[PDB]
Design a protein around this ligand. Structure first.
Ligand SMILES: NC(=O)c1cccc(N)c1
Length: 238
């Protein structure tokens, strides 16, 4: 939450820090920013009134993270307040994974079935307690299944903080679409605009790898949000 703690977080894992900045930039740029940029930095809201022009303005003046970490403020207070906000969570963290990691995800999802591309970047999501212990409690003796969910890039800031995919709900039969076949997930992950100063590249596509408690529920739909969580992000840079 502080400048000193963000500097440390960004330092450990640049790519994870950059992914968060990129997903923020994607949600903020979107014409759907009001709906997709949730959570929204409180410092840019009077009441329920979101200062999007002030936000777009400060986000566009952000240097890349190597440049930010070489500055240490103090005239760059706005940049650090925003980046420190982007990098904050008491619920979870994002970590960089290798590419021998894709082999692990392909093992958990089985034989690729359809030929598909390897992600350019891989990220693992760590959940904190109570939620992480609660998840395994709900799991019990049941085994964990791994399936994919693709989405437009402007939706992953929200997916990573609120999960898939929240329930005003209003309609019946609502739930998350999953598939063991990444090729099917990928057609729902088109390239979207990221961040111009990203180490990942400015145009990205992102697929979620979901950890599902095996319960009675080619693709399938999970109606109970308590029995799944996002565990990995597969990032492709155009
Ligand atoms: N959004 C998705 O990644 C997905 C996966 C399986 C089936 C469908 N309709 C969608």
């Amino acid at each position: 939450m502080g400048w000193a703690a963000a500097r440390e977080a960004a330092g450990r894992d640049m790519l994870a820090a950059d992914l968060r900045c990129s997903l923020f930039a994607s949600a903020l740029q979107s014409y759907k920013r009001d709906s997709v940029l949730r959570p929204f930095p409180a410092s840019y809201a009077r009441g329920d009134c979101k200062d999007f022009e002030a936000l777009l303005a400060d986000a566009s003046k952000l240097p890349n993270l190597k440049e930010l970490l070489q500055s240490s403020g103090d005239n760059h207070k706005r940049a650090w307040d925003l980046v420190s906000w982007i990098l904050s969570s008491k619920v979870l963290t994002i970590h960089s994974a290798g590419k021998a990691e894709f082999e692990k995800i392909q093992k958990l999802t089985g034989a690729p079935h359809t030929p598909v591309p390897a992600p350019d970047f891989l990220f693992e999501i760590e959940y904190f307690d109570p939620a992480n212990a609660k998840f395994y409690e709900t799991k019990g003796e049941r085994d964990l299944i791994y399936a994919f969910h693709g989405s437009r890039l402007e939706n992953f800031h929200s997916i990573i903080h609120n999960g898939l995919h929240c329930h005003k709900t209003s309609l019946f039969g609502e739930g998350t679409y999953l598939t063991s076949d990444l090729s099917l997930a990928l057609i729902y992950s088109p390239h979207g605009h990221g961040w111009q100063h990203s180490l990942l590249g400015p145009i990205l596509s992102c697929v979620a790898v979901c950890e599902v408690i095996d319960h009675p529920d080619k693709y399938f739909v999970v109606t109970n949000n308590q029995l799944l969580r996002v565990k990995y992000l597969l990032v492709y840079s155009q």
